[PDB]
Ligand binder design. Structure first.
Ligand SMILES: Nc1ncnc2c1ncn2[C@@H]1O[C@H](COP(=O)(O)OP(=O)(O)O)[C@@H](O)[C@H]1O
Ligand SMILES: Nc1ncnc2c1ncn2[C@@H]1O[C@H](COP(=O)(O)OP(=O)(O)O)[C@@H](O)[C@H]1O
Lengths: 216, 344, 343, 216
C-alpha cells in the first residue's frame, strides 16, 4: 500500500464514522418524536386519531419505500438549496438523515408497542400528564428497544453512507467505488471491505453491550 | 360519604353493535370502610371502578370523592384529585426499568417534590408493606406478592384518602391473597384509608369488606352490608357467590338423582341457611331426638363475614311424612332458613 | 401393557444434578385406566415420556406389549411408537391442516392408500363427535374440540396404549368432564390401556382404576383409587384428598383452639367415614343414644371408584360420660374419630 | 416525454423485475436450505450441533455485515469469472443473490423458531422422520412467515437492484443515476421515483395479501 493511501483511508474511516453517526443523531431527533406521535395516535391510546395516524403512517411508508440511492439522487436539488452543495461530507448528511427518519420512527413505535398498556393506566391514575408519561414512563421502558433500534439504525447508515460514495459523499464508500470499480487496486479494495466489516461488528458489539446493560 | 357514585351509566360502541356497560349504578362508600363490588366477568366491574377515577367517562351519572365532583372537571384539576385516590391492579403495573424504591417515588415526582421527602416517604411506605429489605431490587426479581406490596406502597405515596382495587389479588395464589388482603385490611384500620374493591372472588369480599355490592350485567342486583348479604342473601345469584366461597360440592351423582317431582321411598334433599343465632345452636342434634328424624349431611360449612357467623348445609332428612314435616317446621322457628331442593 | 422397572433419569443441565425420577417401577394392567398424581417438578412429565422414549431414562427398563423399547433401532422405534398414542396439555395440532387432515398425518407418515386413510380418519372422527367438523381448522375449534382431534389422531395407528400428559390441564371443568368421559368410553369399548399424569386429583377420581402418587422422582403409593381416596396411606395423599373434599376449618377457630382440655370445654373432632358408614344416620343416632350435640363446622362427602367417603369437622356437646360414649360407639361403627383439640 | 426515451425507461422496469425476482428466487434456493440447517441445528432442536451452528451462523453473519455495494464491487472479479461479463443484469444477479441469501436464511431460521415446539413432540411420538418433521410439519406451519420473508426479501432486493445502476447493472436505478446524478432531467427522475415506489407497494400488497390467505 502507498503511504498517501493509508492516510486517505483514515479520512474515509473518519468521513464514514462522521456521516453515519451524525445522520443517525439527526434521524432520531426527528424519527423519535415522529415515532412517539405515531404510537399515541393509534386507536385506544392517549390521544387517538384515526386520520392523523393514517397520514403520518402512509408518508413514513412512502419515504421508507424509496431505495436510498434514489432518495439521494432525487434529493440533489434539495441538498444544494439547503447546504449550498450537492458534494461532500456534510452534503451527504441531508439525504442520509432523510433516509433514516422513516426507519427510526417505525422502530420507535414498534418499541413503544412492546410496553404493556396497563403501565399507561397506572400513570394516568397517579395524575400524570401525557408529556410526563412519555419521558417519565414510556421511553425509559423501551430503552432496551430503542437502544436496539439505534444499533440497527447506525449499521443501516453505514451501508447508506457507503452507497453515498458513488454519488460523492466521500468516505470509505468513495474509496471503494474508485479503487474497486472505476479502476482497481486489489489491496485498497480488500482493506475497504475489512474496514467496513469491522466498523459494523464494532457498532453491533457495542450496542449489544449497552442493551445487555439495561436492567431486566 | 367519602365516595359517591350516582346513577352511573356507561355505554360503549365497539362494533356495529352497542353494548351497555353500566346501567344506573349508584353506591356510597362511607369513609373508613372497605367496599366490595363482586360479579361475573363482563358485568362492568372494571368499568365501574374506573369511572371513580375517570379513567373512564361515565356516559351519564355523578362521581363524587371527598365531596369533590369529578365528571365535569379541568384536566389540571383531575391530577390533584388523583393524588387523593391511589390505585392498584391485577397485573401489577410496575416499571421494569426502576428499582422497587424509585417505582414508589414516581408519583411523588409527578408533582415536583424535594428529593429529601421522597427518600423519607418511600422508606416509610416500604417498611409498612414489608419490602424495606428490598429497596434496591428490580421487579423482574420480585415474586407476585412483593410486586403488589410495591404497587400498594406506590399508590399510598401521595398519602391518598381513597384506595381503589382492580382485581388486585386475582393473579396471586391462595396463600398470598390472604397476606395481601390482610395488609390492605390493616391500612384501613390503622390509617383509616377508604377502600373501593372489585373482585370475581366472593372470598375477597368476606375477608376484608364491610359493605358489598353484587353487580350483574351493568346492574346492581343486591346492595346491602356484608353481614347482611352473607346472612339472609336476597338474591339467587348472591347465594351462588356465597355458596361458592364456602366450597360446597353436590356431587354429579346427587344432581342426577335429585328430581323436583316427589316419588315413593323418597326423602327430601334440602339446603339450610344458618345465621349467627342459629349457627352454634344444636338445632340438628335436638331435631333428631325430638322429631325422631335422621339427618344426613351431604356437605356443610360454617364461616364468618363482617364479624358475623353463618353457614350452609346440604342434607337429606330421613323420617316419617309427619316427623319430617314437623322438624322442618321447628328449624324454621329457630332461624334456620329451610329450602327443599327436591326428593331422593 | 406397560411395565417400567426401577426407572431413574438424571438431567445433564446447569452444573446441577436433578432427580426427575429415582428408582421408579410401574406395571399397568392391560385394559386399565391408570393415573399418576404429583406436584410440579415431581417428575411425572419426565416419566410419561419414558414410555414412548420421548425421554431416555439414564437407567431402568421400558417394555410395551412385551417389547423392551430401550434398545431399539430408530426405525424400529417408529414401528414401536405406532402402538402408543399420545396427547398433550396444549393440544399440539398443525394450524395449517383441517380437522380431517390433522388426524390423517400419522397415517401419512407410514404410508397408507388414499382410501384407507379416508376410511380410518372418517371413522375415528365420528367416534370423537367431530364428523360434523371435518373441514374446520384448529383456528375455529374449542380446547375440547381440539383435544378430540388430538384423540382421534392418537388412535390412527390403532394402538394398545394411550398416553395423557396433563391432557385436561387447561379445560372447561364441564369439558374436562366430556373428554374424560370419552377416554373412558374408549377404555370400556375398545380395551385401550390408558396411562395419565395430572396435578388434578379430580381427574384421578373420575376415570382411574389405579393411581400412583409421586414425589422427588419417586412414587410412594401404588394402589387402587378406592384405597387411596378412602384409606390414604401417606399424609401427602391425604392432603390431596383435602383438595377434592374441600375442608375448611374457619380461621376464628385456630386462635380459639386449645391443645388440652380446659374447664367448660367441648372437644373438636375429625370424623372420617367409609362406604356404608357414609349413608348411616350415625350422628343422628348419637343425638338420641348418648344425648350429645354434634355441631358441624365443615363436612364433605365424595365418591371415588365405587366407594363413598367423607370427612367432617364437628364439635360434640355432652357429658364426659356421654361424649366418651358416643365417640366409642362411633368408633365401634368404624367412624374414625380424631380429637383435634378443644373449644 | 420522448417516445425514444420512455421505451428505454420501460425497458428498465423490466430490468428491475428480472433482477429482483431472479435473485429472490436463487436467494431462497440457497437461503431456505441453509435456514432449516441453522434452525434444526440449534441446541434444543433436531440435529443440534452447537459447533456446526456456530460455523454456519458465522458465515451467515459476516456476509450480512458487508454493505451491498461494497459486496457488489468487491465481487466483480468473481461475478465475471462466473458470467464472463460484469455490466448488465445477468451478471448483477450474482452479487444480488449473494446479497440476499444470508439475509434470507436468518429469516428462515427465525420463521421456524416461530412455530411451537411440541408439534415436534406430538410429531416425534407419531414415528416421524427428521425429514418428515421438516417437510410434513415444520415448513407448512412456518409458511405465512416464509411468504412474509420473501415480501421483505423482494422489497429489499428492489433497492439492492438499484444500487447496481451506479455500478452499471443496468436497471431503473441506472436510469435514475445517469439522468439523476448527471443529466437531471426532472420528468425522468420523478418518474423513476414513482415507478419504484409503485413497485415496492405491488410487491408488498401481493405478499401482504397472499399471507392473509395462507394463514389458517
Ligand atoms: N373499552 C371497551 N371497548 C369495548 N367494549 C368494552 C370496553 N370495556 C368493556 N367493554 C364491554 O363491556 C363489558 C364491561 O365489563 P368490564 O368493564 O370488563 O368489567 P368486568 O370485570 O365485569 O368484565 C365487557 O364485558 C366488555 O364486553
Ligand atoms: N429436558 C429437560 N432438561 C432439563 N431439566 C428438565 C427437563 N425436563 C424436566 N426437567 C426438570 O426436571 C424435573 C422433572 O420433572 P417433570 O417431569 O417436569 O415433572 P412435572 O410434570 O411434575 O413438572 C422438573 O422439575 C424440571 O424442572
Amino acid at each position: 500500500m502507498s503511504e498517501p493511501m493509508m492516510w486517505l483511508l483514515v479520512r474515509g474511516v473518519w468521513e464514514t464514522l462522521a456521516m453515519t453517526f451524525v445522520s443517525g443523531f439527526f434521524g432520531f431527533v426527528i424519527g423519535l418524536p415522529v415515532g412517539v406521535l405515531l404510537y399515541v395516535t393509534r386507536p385506544g391510546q392517549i390521544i387517538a386519531n384515526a386520520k392523523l395516524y393514517r397520514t403520518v403512517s402512509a408518508i413514513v411508508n412512502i419515504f421508507r419505500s424509496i431505495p436510498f440511492i434514489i432518495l439521494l439522487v432525487w434529493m440533489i436539488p434539495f441538498t444544494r438549496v439547503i447546504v449550498g452543495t450537492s458534494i461532500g461530507l456534510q452534503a451527504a448528511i441531508v439525504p442520509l438523515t432523510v433516509g433514516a427518519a422513516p426507519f427510526i420512527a417505525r422502530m420507535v413505535e414498534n418499541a413503544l408497542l412492546e410496553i404493556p398498556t396497563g403501565l399507561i393506566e397506572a400513570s394516568r391514575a397517579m395524575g400524570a400528564t401525557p408529556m410526563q408519561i412519555v419521558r417519565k414512563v414510556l421511553l425509559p421502558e423501551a430503552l432496551p428497544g430503542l437502544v436496539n433500534a439505534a444499533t440497527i439504525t447506525l449499521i443501516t447508515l453505514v451501508g447508506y453512507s457507503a452507497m453515498g460514495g458513488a454519488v460523492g459523499a466521500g468516505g470509505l464508500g468513495q474509496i471503494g467505488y474508485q479503487y474497486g470499480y472505476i479502476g482497481y487496486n486489489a489491496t485498497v479494495m480488500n482493506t475497504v471491505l475489512v474496514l467496513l466489516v469491522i466498523l459494523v461488528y464494532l457498532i453491533q458489539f457495542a450496542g449489544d453491550r449497552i442493551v445487555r446493560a439495561v436492567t431486566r | 360519604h367519602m365516595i359517591k357514585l350516582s346513577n352511573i351509566t356507561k355505554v360503549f360502541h365497539q362494533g356495529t353493535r352497542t353494548i351497555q356497560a353500566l346501567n344506573n349504578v349508584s353506591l356510597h362508600v362511607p369513609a373508613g370502610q372497605i367496599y366490595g363490588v363482586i360479579g361475573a366477568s363482563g358485568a362492568g366491574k372494571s368499568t365501574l371502578i374506573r369511572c371513580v377515577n375517570l379513567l373512564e367517562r361515565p356516559t351519564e351519572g355523578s362521581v363524587l370523592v371527598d365531596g369533590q365532583e369529578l365528571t365535569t372537571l379541568s384536566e389540571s384539576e383531575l391530577t390533584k384529585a388523583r393524588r387523593q385516590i391511589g390505585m392498584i391492579f391485577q397485573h401489577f403495573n410496575l416499571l421494569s426499568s426502576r428499582t422497587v424504591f424509585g417505582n414508589v417515588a414516581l408519583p411523588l415526582e409527578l408533582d415536583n417534590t424535594p428529593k429529601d421527602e421522597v427518600k423519607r416517604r418511600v422508606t416509610e411506605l416500604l417498611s409498612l408493606v414489608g419490602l424495606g429489605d428490598k429497596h434496591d431490587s428490580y421487579p423482574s426479581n420480585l415474586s407476585g406478592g412483593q410486586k403488589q406490596r410495591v404497587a400498594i406502597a406506590r399508590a399510598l405515596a401521595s398519602n391518598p384518602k381513597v384506595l381503589l382495587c382492580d382485581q388486585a389479588t386475582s393473579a396471586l395464589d391462595p396463600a398470598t391473597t390472604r397476606s395481601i388482603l390482610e395488609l390492605l385490611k390493616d391500612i384501613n384500620r390503622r390509617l383509616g384509608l377508604t377502600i373501593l374493591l372489585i373482585t370475581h372472588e366472593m372470598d375477597v369480599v368476606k375477608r376484608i369488606c364491610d359493605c358489598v355490592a353484587v353487580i350483574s350485567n351493568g346492574e346492581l342486583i343486591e346492595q346491602d352490608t356484608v353481614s347482611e348479604v352473607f346472612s339472609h342473601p336476597k338474591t339467587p345469584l348472591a347465594q351462588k357467590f356465597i355458596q361458592s366461597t364456602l366450597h360446597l360440592d353436590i356431587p354429579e351423582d346427587y344432581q342426577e338423582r335429585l328430581q323436583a317431582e316427589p316419588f315413593t321411598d323418597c326423602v327430601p334433599m334440602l339446603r339450610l341457611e344458618f345465621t349467627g343465632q342459629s349457627v352454634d345452636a344444636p338445632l340438628l342434634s335436638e331435631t333428631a331426638r325430638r322429631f325422631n328424624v335422621n339427618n344426613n349431611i351431604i356437605s356443610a360449612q360454617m364461616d364468618y363475614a363482617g364479624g358475623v357467623k353463618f353457614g350452609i348445609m346440604l342434607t337429606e332428612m330421613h323420617g316419617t311424612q309427619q316427623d319430617t314435616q314437623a322438624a322442618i317446621a321447628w328449624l324454621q322457628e329457630h332461624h334456620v332458613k329451610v329450602e327443599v331442593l327436591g326428593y331422593v
